[PDB]
């Protein structure tokens, strides 16, 4: 019951939907095809309800990980970009929109954690995690602190744990191996040990969460934090002279944050799949189309190479893409639930001092 000859697009209200509506205006002026952009509340929860009965939008924008369950239910059509179009996007962004060897969405934007620092308290941010204890000593003598970030959630602590060899599921040729988990290896032990040592040596508080860390950095009480592009607007209001750079390395190896990819899927029940392909490939995924959305609300880093190179003149965006390329695409498989439990459990047990790092990791699996 989706109307044929027009396009209905769903995108979250936190995105530049008025900018996207301008791209739809250009598409209608050129092709005669009316495009209607909507930002319904909780669209990612409404989509599987209406798409299951042949309803819903023609196009849906959301984070790539949710599209795994959509394709599992057969709600997303397979897209058909040729070789030349795929070369215009960074190769790793296509890994985020693949389900069982099939492309099921177009990569739009790229987000990842970065190292955020106070330029006044710290003109040169550290390049390594090993420097941070000495840096905290010099800052604690001034009533300040070196680093405060959300220790309570594994999304924020995994980049350090993965740095020396930790991994979620062994990634091969677009297929995750649910049997090869890398949470209890020598790389993950060294990262958690350094994290726990930061807490035991009183450089970080084991109770610091997202809200505490954000308040301390925006009030100038700490020199660094770790967060993503979604947090920049709160710092802009704080008027703190901040910068965004690459995450510190551990044992000479980069921090490996998870990568979220805003993706555009095509409804499997849509009768306008070719129009949807034409709109996404030839109007939106261009320098002109992404700029219209970006002008409305910034996308952060984008998958389109040519426009990312322009946006990367903002050093905060360049750092975001740099950390993302040094990180890993967040897996879109249901087995991530068990992975999150293991990492969250091992950190809380080891940080409080109840268990050793080795005991904390092996007990999180059992």
């Amino acid at each position, epitope marked *: 019951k989706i109307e044929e000859g027009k396009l209905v697009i769903w995108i979250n209200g936190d995105k530049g939907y008025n900018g996207l509506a301008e791209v739809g205006k250009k598409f209608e002026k050129d092709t005669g095809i009316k495009v209607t952009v909507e930002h319904p509340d909780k669209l990612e*929860e409404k989509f599987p*309800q209406v798409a299951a009965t042949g309803d819903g939008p023609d196009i849906i924008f959301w984070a790539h990980d949710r599209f795994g369950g959509y394709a599992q239910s057969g709600l997303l059509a397979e897209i058909t970009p040729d070789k030349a179009f795929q070369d215009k996007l960074y190769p790793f962004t296509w890994d985020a929109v693949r389900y069982n060897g099939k492309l099921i969405a177009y990569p739009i934007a790229v987000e990842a954690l970065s190292l955020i620092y106070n330029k006044d308290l710290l003109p040169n941010p550290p390049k390594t995690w090993e420097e941070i204890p000495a840096l905290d000593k010099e800052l604690k003598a001034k009533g300040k602190s070196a680093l405060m970030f959300n220790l309570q*959630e594994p999304y924020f602590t995994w980049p350090l744990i993965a740095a020396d060899g930790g991994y979620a599921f062994k990634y091969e040729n677009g297929k995750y191996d649910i049997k090869d988990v890398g949470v209890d290896n020598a790389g993950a032990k060294a990262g958690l040990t350094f994290l726990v040592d930061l807490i035991k040596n009183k450089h970080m508080n084991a109770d610091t*969460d997202y*809200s505490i860390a954000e308040a301390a950095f925006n009030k100038g009480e700490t020199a660094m934090t770790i967060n993503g592009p979604w947090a920049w607007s709160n710092i802009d209001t704080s008027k703190v002279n901040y910068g965004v750079t690459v995450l510190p390395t551990f044992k000479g190896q980069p921090s490996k944050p*998870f990568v979220g990819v805003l993706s555009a899927g095509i409804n499997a029940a849509s009768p306008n799949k070719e129009l949807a392909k034409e709109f996404l490939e030839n109007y939106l995924l261009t320098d002109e189309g992404l700029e219209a959305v970006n002008k409305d609300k910034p996308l952060g880093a984008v998958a389109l190479k040519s426009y990312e190179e322009e946006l990367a003149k903002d050093p905060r965006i360049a750092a975001t893409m740099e950390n993302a390329q040094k990180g890993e695409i967040m897996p879109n498989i249901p087995q*991530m*639930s068990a992975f*999150w439990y293991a990492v969250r459990t091992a950190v809380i047990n080891a940080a409080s001092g109840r268990q050793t790092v080795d005991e904390a990791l092996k007990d999180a699996q059992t």
Partner: antibody
Amino acid sequence: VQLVESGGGLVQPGGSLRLSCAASGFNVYYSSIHWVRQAPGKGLEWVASIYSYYGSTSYADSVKGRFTISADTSKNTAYLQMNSLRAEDTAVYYCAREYHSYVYEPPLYGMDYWGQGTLVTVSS
Amino acid sequence: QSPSSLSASVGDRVTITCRASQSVSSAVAWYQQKPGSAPSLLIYSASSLYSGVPSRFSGSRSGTDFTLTISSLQPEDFATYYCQQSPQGYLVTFGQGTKVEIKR
């Protein structure tokens, strides 16, 4: 979109009771399901939560070690297993949904949907 | 805990301050509960009005203080109001209830 509760009733101190929260209209896997109880004439008290997508469960101090929250994704239903019950556990028990957009978010959106509540009386 | 009491008239402006939110600076939600019914969400993230709630309800944050304001009390507004915080992200605490009652 609905949250239907069942499993309440009478129970003795030291006994056990298992509450159920069957959901429809959304997938509990991608939400936090909360249990909130309210003693007669008293205010709300948070009990436990489960966020299966993020592999997390949480418990209030007053029930930690005695209650166990779980979920059955195939049945779209959450459970509260209450053990070692005491008279102070007597209350109307609600289940509620807390919405989440992204994996990085802290709690933001509160509890938009609530069950009808079921009365649990712990007494000899 | 037994809920606090506040007596007001139709048309009055009422401002409720969350007492449990003095713990931390996290997001604050407000709820309305009538006798014999489940609470209903009014406001989330301190100031975002939940879909469908009348615009006379508003929430604000000024530093560590979170308030809920009813600009002009309507007859259907006399009920009990709760604020909800998340001190450590995993923990959840509801404040003491504030029951708005009818002046006569």
